[PDB]
Amino acid sequence: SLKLQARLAADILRCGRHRVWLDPNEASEISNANSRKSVRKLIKDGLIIRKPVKVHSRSRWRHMKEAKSMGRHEGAGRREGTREARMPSKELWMRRLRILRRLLRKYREEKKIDRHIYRELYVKAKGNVFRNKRNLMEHIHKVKNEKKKE
Amino acid sequence: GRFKPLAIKKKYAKKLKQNRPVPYWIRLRTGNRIKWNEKRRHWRRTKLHY
Amino acid sequence: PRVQYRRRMHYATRGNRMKLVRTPGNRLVMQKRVKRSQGPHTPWVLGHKRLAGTKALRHTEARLASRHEKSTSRPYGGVLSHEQVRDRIVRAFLIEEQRIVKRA
Amino acid sequence: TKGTTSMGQRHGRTHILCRRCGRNAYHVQWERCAACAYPRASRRRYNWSVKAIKRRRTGTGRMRYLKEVNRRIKNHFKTSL
RNA sequence: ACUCGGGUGGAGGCCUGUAGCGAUGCUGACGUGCAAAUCGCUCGCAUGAUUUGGGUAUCGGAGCGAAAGACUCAUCGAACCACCU
RNA sequence: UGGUUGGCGUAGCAAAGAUCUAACGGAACGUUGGAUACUGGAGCGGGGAAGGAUUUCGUGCCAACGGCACUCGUACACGAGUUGUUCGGAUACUGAGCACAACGUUACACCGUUUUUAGGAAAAGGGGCAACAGAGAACCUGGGAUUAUAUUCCAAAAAGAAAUUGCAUG
RNA sequence: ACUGCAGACCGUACUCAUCACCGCAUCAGGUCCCCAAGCAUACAAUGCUCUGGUACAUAGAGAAAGGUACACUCAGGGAAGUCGGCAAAAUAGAUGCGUAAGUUCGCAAGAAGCAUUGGCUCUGAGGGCAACAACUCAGAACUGCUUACGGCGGGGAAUCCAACUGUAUAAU
RNA sequence: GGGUAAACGGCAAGGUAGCCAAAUGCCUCGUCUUCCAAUUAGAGACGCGCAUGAAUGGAUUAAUGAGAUUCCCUCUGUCCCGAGUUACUAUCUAGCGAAACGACAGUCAAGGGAACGGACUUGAAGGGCUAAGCGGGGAAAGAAGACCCUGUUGAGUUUGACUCCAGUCUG
RNA sequence: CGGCUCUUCCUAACCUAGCGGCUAAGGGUUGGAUUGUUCACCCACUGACAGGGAACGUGAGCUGGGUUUAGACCGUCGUGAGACAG
RNA sequence: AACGUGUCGCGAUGGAUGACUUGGCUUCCUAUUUCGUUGAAGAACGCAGCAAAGUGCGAUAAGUGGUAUCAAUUGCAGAUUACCGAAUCUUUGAACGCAAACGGCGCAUGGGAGAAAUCCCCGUGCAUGCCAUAUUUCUCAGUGUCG
RNA sequence: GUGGAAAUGCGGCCAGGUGACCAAUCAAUCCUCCCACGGUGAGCUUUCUUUUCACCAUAAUCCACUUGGGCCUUUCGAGUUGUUCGGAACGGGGGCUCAAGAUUGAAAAAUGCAGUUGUGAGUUCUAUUAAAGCAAAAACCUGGGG
RNA sequence: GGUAUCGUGAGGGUAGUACGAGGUACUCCCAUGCCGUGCCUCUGGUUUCUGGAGUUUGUCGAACGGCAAGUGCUCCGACGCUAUCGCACGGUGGUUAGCCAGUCCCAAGACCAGAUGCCCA
RNA sequence: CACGUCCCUCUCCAAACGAGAGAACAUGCAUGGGCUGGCAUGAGCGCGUGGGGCCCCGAGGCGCUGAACCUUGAGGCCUCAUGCUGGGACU
């Protein structure tokens, strides 16, 4: 009845009882292992072993994580969530606007664009008159060539 | 839990060492009446609510 | 890794904030997160602003800190913003100069 | 749910042991004893309950000194010099 | 004259709904029960007059009540204990 | 009031899915291995408060109890076990509050105010209490350290490393 | 700076729960706090899984009637049942359309109502830092359906009452 | 003597605006219309309103509602009209093991009778013991009927009952 | 109270049968709208939709709509608490 | 047959009964009979070689001392009984230095250990009210009365 | 006492501050999680699998030293995801300072473990209603004055 | 006396009913309804043959194969059970429509000296 | 003790349990086969959206393939083939 050692093995294997393995074939030598120091002798001595944690593979998932990248498993039937839960409008607006405010800020820093037009666009960027970076990227180009002519 | 005034710990300590079977040799005295301890307590039954 | 409290207290109050901490022994261990105080401020009636030369020492360690860690070496140094001192140095001077004129 | 399910709602103590009587009758919130009336100097004692007067009167305890002074009055307080 | 787009923002005794707090219906189970009021599903509220621990205050011809004579230790159209009895 | 009875070996012991196997043990359910499921992180997880107060742990035991059984038990018996300058609490905060004092009232203090018609300093407004979730609060890890405690134990290479309080010392 | 000595008190085990507390019990009830993984998913819903835990809820054999169920299915009909659509079914996610009366102009509204939705192989879009990073949306062919988890509103038209959220006879 | 009804209330004044067989209408299922094959229902009108009506608030109201109510679509085992399957029970076993109840019992028909017998009269049945059901009877059990009445019994509430007592105010 | 469910018995017979009103208790006597109902009245079928008893058959069979205690609303009554077989 | 019924004989369950009674109840009496700030009663915690309770006691702890008495106590072991003067009498409690679900904390006094003093233990005092007194006649306060 | 033009750096009483008080969000770290790489161990292995799983740890304390804010100075734009801001000083250059944080190292590899970093996500911590405005105090700090 | 077998049948139960069409105004036909007694070939329903397939999420490293989702879900699905939702069947004699007997159902506590088989230490 | 009945055991037209029907060395049971059915074309290897540098990746598709599997079990068929084979109670 080596229920004590199993208490002990689990503690000094630094795991649960579920993982510790008391050798079925040598219950008696395990049986007289009253001290943690006795059991530690049994652990090096191989009567007691910690089993590896039961596997929980991600290979099904990583293979899925490939297919999702390629757009698999994406469509209408595969969507529980509202389009806003599934990807927040505030999340897009921040990203969109942090990006615009940064590019306006990059040109103002290299002065590709006037410190004047920066307000002209910093404030239009906030009214999403610019869908993208390259929408603003070309507006800065065409808001500027209009100046180049004069 | 942990908390106990020592006065309560002294009392549970009191009732704890008081919670003992009668000595065997006491029953062998002349004119003895006692057999079992009539004041055995069990935590799961009588409560020493302190 | 799930953690539990180590100090005898066990409530998620503001004064009992804790920090999860992987240890050298590869334990993951909650540690008391210090009850940081904001530091010295100019007085509440003067807009209550954090002072510049002063550290936000907890008074538990403020006793052991150097004196100038909690002040600047200016008049009212641990008490007033520099503008607040200058407000007075002007207001002391200019107000007395009008009174000195009201004798005439 | 006034029965067994509200018995679980009750969690505190009204009374802890008294410093005098040792009864679990010390109302912790009104720091007094329901039994001895402690901290009041004069101990609680009612004639409508003599079963309780009798229960805690003198002779109920050791009468630790009173045995000594009783023996002395009986012996005229005889004394060695 | 201050309106029509579009975004932004995150308001509300706002909505759906967890937890939690309830408790409508089945007049379901149980009904000498698991239970001296419970179980199941259903359902209601769930940012608020919310829920909740500790502490503290207010009670018996009294207390407390968004008021049902409700609740005040399974006791309330007057608790419980003892006593008169 | 005690005992006994029929009903009656009956009504039932049907909520939460679950055990199987071999080996061993034993006088005959446990233990281990394997298998199989379950919980499914708002857990039949790991720590605490209240509450409980020895239930802890080991050995033994299984008479009684664990509504079946037990070889097992939170049961029984015996022996153990809880280690702190730093954790929490007090020392040492105040809070809703409370109440000693005094004073007043009451046939009566077991009432009330909570400062007292009041000389409250002993070397302007008396004393105290009231929070283990508020304020305060000097310590960390490693351990081969237990049957059972550890931020508490470890020993001179303190495994070690700190911070901190008091006094004193150059 | 240093060093030297000293650093006292009490708590400390265990529990915290379908057997350790309250409920006469190892009672399906009640009981504050903290930590809290992976996958699907909008998710602390739900399902399932590593870790940590369990395998304790008396068991066996077999499968009358009648029951209980957090079990279904039912031809044709479709509320005729009934006091009463009670109970059950039904709706259902997301996207795009579309949305009436009435209105205090907020709403009503998820009104209502159609519609598309898988798999797969592609495409497009959306950024960062200098001189590599997401993962949503969009589209396209091809192809598949037994319409095939879980979870998830039934709707409408009216009358009475109360304006609203709320409270409230613990145990009809 | 005066004032006061968003005092109690009425409709001294005689019910105004409204609204209704309304949760308020006896008559009554009112009458008409609408809904159906058919409607004591509903909705909408009507108003001889037993007994509507204005902060004892009147009317009307979008939104809200586990509120009452009617109908509709969908839907279905609600039903026609039940059938089949599941799992746990029940059933049988091993273990364990109550309770309620319990005068005594316990087949009926007639009769009589405290006026509906298990005991009596006269007939008719009935071998005994069982197991599972069952729910007709045992006026089965449950609790000295919560109904009602009685008592020179209670308590709660009310009050312009009797008797008072504080409070208030006045002197 | 009612229904539902199930059985049963009667006949001053509704249908059916035999007669010429009589005999005849045999077997049968519908499905629905309103309403708790019974009852009534309607719609439809039907050969017909007869009337009754069985503790106004039948609640340890159910259902709980009626009656329906406490909650509440209205009308009327009441100075009021409260009453109303409304 | 069986079950069931019944008689009898034994036996179990049960605990009446009878006898017993170091208990109660009631009556009567006696006296050098009436607690406590010199810490009472009550409560707590402890003390025996094995001792939980009860009793006894209080860190001098089922007792120390005095007295009488005697040879025991007695479950085992091991080498008393009765009374009463001297003491002992822990934490508390009117409880009183301040508190108190704290075996907490003071101030002053003396001691102790100790130690590189700080810490630590201990004893005693330290509540309020009131009366007396300041016996070598304490220190004071009052726009009280005067001087 | 003292440096610095300045922001500021270093070496009884009185008044002020800390105590001290907000949902969220944003950001940083924390943490957890994922991925990539690399090692190490284990497992699958009929077939297939440069594969699946696990692990790759870094304590307080101390020492040197990017983001957000305040400020100094000097010579219509600024700004946030967002309801702002600016001669009562915006922006730009340099500086100061606070708050987090990073890295350098001491601890500390004599430990752990067993026979590596980095990268992504989440978590974490540090306005609104308001006729609601969202404790106190000791301790402690700093000053003014002495 | 056992055991067994075939029967007897006192007694008790007891049921068929209605409608319509044809044919000619009885007979005679032919369907149906209800009732009743069965049965399951067919047809429908039912699936825990979880049979076979498909399929969703989780999971087993993957394919295969599974597995979990309290039978995951969808399709088909035998056996069986069952439906007026299928199908078969529902008979006479005698007395005064009744009624009785029979057929039909239980039938020896109706105690069958009915028969019969076997053994009767 | 006879005959025999019963139990145990096996089968099911029976069945809550008793009872019933049967068996009693028997194609009885067991697997297997054949069949009748069911489903619906297995595993495995060997035309195609495009894609990657002649092949590879590719859902789906094709071929072997009315295949695969299942088919008596609360109890389909076939003797077709092999396999395995009394004790107790009572009078």
Ligand SMILES: [Mg+2]
């Ligand atoms: Mg306690």
Ligand SMILES: [Mg+2]
């Ligand atoms: Mg109560």
Ligand SMILES: [Mg+2]
């Ligand atoms: Mg409570």
Ligand SMILES: [Mg+2]
């Ligand atoms: Mg809301």
Ligand SMILES: [Mg+2]
């Ligand atoms: Mg809702």
Ligand SMILES: [Mg+2]
């Ligand atoms: Mg009332």
Ligand SMILES: [Mg+2]
């Ligand atoms: Mg039973």
Ligand SMILES: [Mg+2]
């Ligand atoms: Mg699971």
Ligand SMILES: [Mg+2]
């Ligand atoms: Mg144990």
Ligand SMILES: [Mg+2]
């Ligand atoms: Mg014990």
Ligand SMILES: [Mg+2]
């Ligand atoms: Mg206060």
Ligand SMILES: [Mg+2]
């Ligand atoms: Mg305090």
Ligand SMILES: [Mg+2]
């Ligand atoms: Mg605190």
Ligand SMILES: [Mg+2]
């Ligand atoms: Mg501390």
Ligand SMILES: [Mg+2]
């Ligand atoms: Mg432990």
Ligand SMILES: [Mg+2]
């Ligand atoms: Mg512990």
